[PDB]
Design a protein around this nucleic acid. Structure first.
Lengths: 65, 153, 115, 126, 31
RNA sequence: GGGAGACUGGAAUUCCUGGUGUAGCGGUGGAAUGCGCAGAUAUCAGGAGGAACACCGGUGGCGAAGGCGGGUCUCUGGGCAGUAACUGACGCUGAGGAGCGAAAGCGUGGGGAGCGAACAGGAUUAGAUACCCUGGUAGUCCACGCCGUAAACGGUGGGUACUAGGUGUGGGUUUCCUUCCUUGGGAUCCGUGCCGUAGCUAACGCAUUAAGUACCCCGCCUGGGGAGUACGGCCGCAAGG
């Protein structure tokens, strides 16, 4: 299917501070993209979702613009 | 009509007028198969119209037909377990049929002491736009318009 | 008054549709409803009634000086596309289309299911 | 409700009992009853365990409702006929309360013969 | 298993509960 | 998403206040009760409060079961893998007994937005103590305690060993294609599904997660009603168990 860009040897760490790294993972409506569309592993999907929620909590990402 | 459409009867052109419409009219006024009497009635009415107005009878007959020809009609439709009066477009043949039937009937309930006179008066007023068949077209168009909300299905 | 640019708000529910042309600051200058154009009961949930209400509201905005509008559609789809089309067809220039339907984040309990 | 009974042979008092029992069914019918006929017959053969046969016919606004029973005497046959007719009238109702559960519901949930077909665009969704 | 058995048991239970409800104060006063 | 505590975020519903703004709104298969003309519905701004946490989010994870997902911090339980350093049979089951145990319900004190038994109207109906509509009280929520039941179900007690495979998916260790990026592939341990042998079963089906082949311990059954009822007893504030 597709690649978990985080399991690779160059997998950047997932943080709630780097906004662009998260913006690539949310749809144009601000919703979190599904795992099958993204293709990352379950642990990284959980990390991404938690980071997105944390970023929203500090007004770094819109709550569904 | 479960297995498909049925063929139409190609009725012949009239000899003394050469028009399809007059044969359709005589077949509409026909009763019990007395075709000769129906032809006499229609020819007499056309001649009365020609005498009254002074011109060709077929042209005024066509004018009356266009004046009473409908375009929009209402049929009951059952969609999703519910019935409503849905306005529906009328095909040309059904419009001609409806116009002729209306003309013949409303002439049958006139008060001119003879069917030839009743028919002639009805066709003349339909030509001028005052017949009861013209009225009937007015109410059918009104009813079709008043139910326009249901035209989407 | 004279408001050259305004906003159009269309609310299409399952049994009605309300159009209100609005000054961009949020003030309503002309509104038309499905029941305002002669429909009542179940008749006013039809797309034709939505078209009529949209046209009436568009006219009532037009003599007020409104020339260009942007719409904010909302509600379950009943006559939304019809309403926008009637807005355009009544002499109003439609700039942008935006769907703003209130979407709860799982708050408040819906009523019990009908049977 | 007026009922005409066409018995035969020997069945004393069967006509009155049948008339009185059947006439009580008019209120159960949801549409006016245009006609009502009852026929009582008895089997000649003594070997028949249920000799008496009762039949009914009601014209419920053009809808024909009929039933037939067998019994050992007139009273039992009439009572069983009344029960059968009541069941038939219950199944015939056809007013709104009787067809509110069969009208298709929802939008996409459930499918029925008269359910509204889904609208499909020209191009494949993709 | 058929639901008929459940129906018989539930009707017995419902009747018993109705009987208990109908005689609550009488039982309290006799006991 | 194992549990407990504390703090905290945003969307939405409702209400209140103030603008714009008019004559309908709401509801249904169709309507009517109802709300509004004393300015409703709609739209904008501001404010108060309560409850539930969209997307992630699945036949995916965790828990003995009931069950558990907004975020953060604090405290805390279990599991798995590898090494195999340590002890050296310390194991298994478990009558009674103790603990936990959805929802509803009960007590005391708060809270109460939405939903909503009861209760009111409206409608349908021959009749509607109903289904549908408009309202709506307990309750739902919190603290501390009772209750001790469920289709508490995989309708399958626990432990152990053995008996063809194929293919998904979750957690971890490792050899070889090696770009070593790649579900590369293999091997292995622990889960969780589907399909299928042998075998078993009345059949349906189960089938390495057994309902197969065996061993240890526990619970239970002995035709259907009467009846999980009466009587007596124990527990409970009561309902009742």
């Amino acid at each position: 299917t597709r690649k978990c860009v985080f399991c690779s040897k160059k997998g950047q760490t997932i943080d709630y501070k780097d906004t662009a790294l998260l913006r690539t993972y949310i749809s144009e409506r601000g919703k979190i993209r599904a795992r099958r569309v993204t293709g990352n592993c379950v642990q990284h999907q959980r990390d991404i979702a938690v980071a997105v929620k944390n970023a929203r909590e500090v007004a770094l990402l819109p709550f569904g613009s | 009509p479960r297995k498909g459409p049925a063929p139409k009867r190609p009725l012949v052109n009239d000899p003394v007028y050469g028009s399809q419409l007059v044969t359709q009219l005589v077949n509409k006024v026909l009763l019990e198969g007395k075709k000769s009497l129906a032809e006499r009635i229609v020819y007499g009415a056309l001649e009365q119209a020609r005498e009254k107005t002074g011109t060709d009878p077929v042209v005024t007959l066509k004018r009356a037909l266009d004046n009473v020809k409908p375009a929009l009609e209402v049929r009951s439709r059952r969609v999703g377990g519910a019935t409503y009066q849905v306005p529906v477009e009328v095909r040309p043949d059904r419009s001609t049929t409806l116009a002729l039937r209306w003309l013949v009937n409303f002439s049958r309930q006139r008060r001119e002491k003879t069917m030839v006179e009743r028919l002639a008066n009805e066709i003349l007023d339909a030509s001028n736009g005052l017949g009861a068949s013209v009225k009937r077209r007015e109410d059918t168009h009104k009813m079709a318009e008043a139910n326009r909300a249901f035209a989407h299905y | 008054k004279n408001v050259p640019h305004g906003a159009a708000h269309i609310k299409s529910t399952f049994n009605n549709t309300i159009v209100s042309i609005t000054d961009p600051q949020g003030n309503v200058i002309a509104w038309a409803s499905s029941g305002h154009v002669g429909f009542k009961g179940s008749r006013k949930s039809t797309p034709f009634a939505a078209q009529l209400a949209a046209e009436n509201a568009a006219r009532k905005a037009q003599e007020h000086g409104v020339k260009k509008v942007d719409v904010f559609v909302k509600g379950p789809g009943s006559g939304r596309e019809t309403a926008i089309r009637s807005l355009q067809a009544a002499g109003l220039e439609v700039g942008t289309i935006s769907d703003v339907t209130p979407q709860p984040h799982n708050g408040c309990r819906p009523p019990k299911r009908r049977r | 409700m007026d009922v005409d009974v066409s018995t035969d042979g020997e069945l004393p008092g069967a006509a009155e009992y049948a008339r009185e029992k059947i006439g009580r069914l008019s209120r159960r019918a949801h549409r006016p009853v245009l006609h009502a006929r009852v026929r009582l017959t008895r089997h000649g053969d003594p070997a028949v365990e249920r000799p008496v046969i009762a039949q009914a016919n009601l014209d419920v606004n053009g809808r024909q409702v009929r039933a037939q029973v067998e019994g050992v005497n007139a009273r039992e046959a009439v009572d069983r006929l009344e029960a059968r007719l009541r069941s038939r009238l219950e199944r015939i109702a056809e007013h709104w309360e009787a067809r509110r559960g069969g009208v298709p519901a929802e939008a996409g949930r459930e499918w029925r013969h008269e359910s509204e077909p889904a609208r499909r665009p020209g191009y494949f969704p993709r | 298993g058929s639901v008929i058995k459940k129906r018989r048991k539930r009707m017995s239970k419902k009747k018993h509960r109705k009987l208990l409800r109908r005689t609550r104060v009488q039982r309290r006063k006799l006991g």
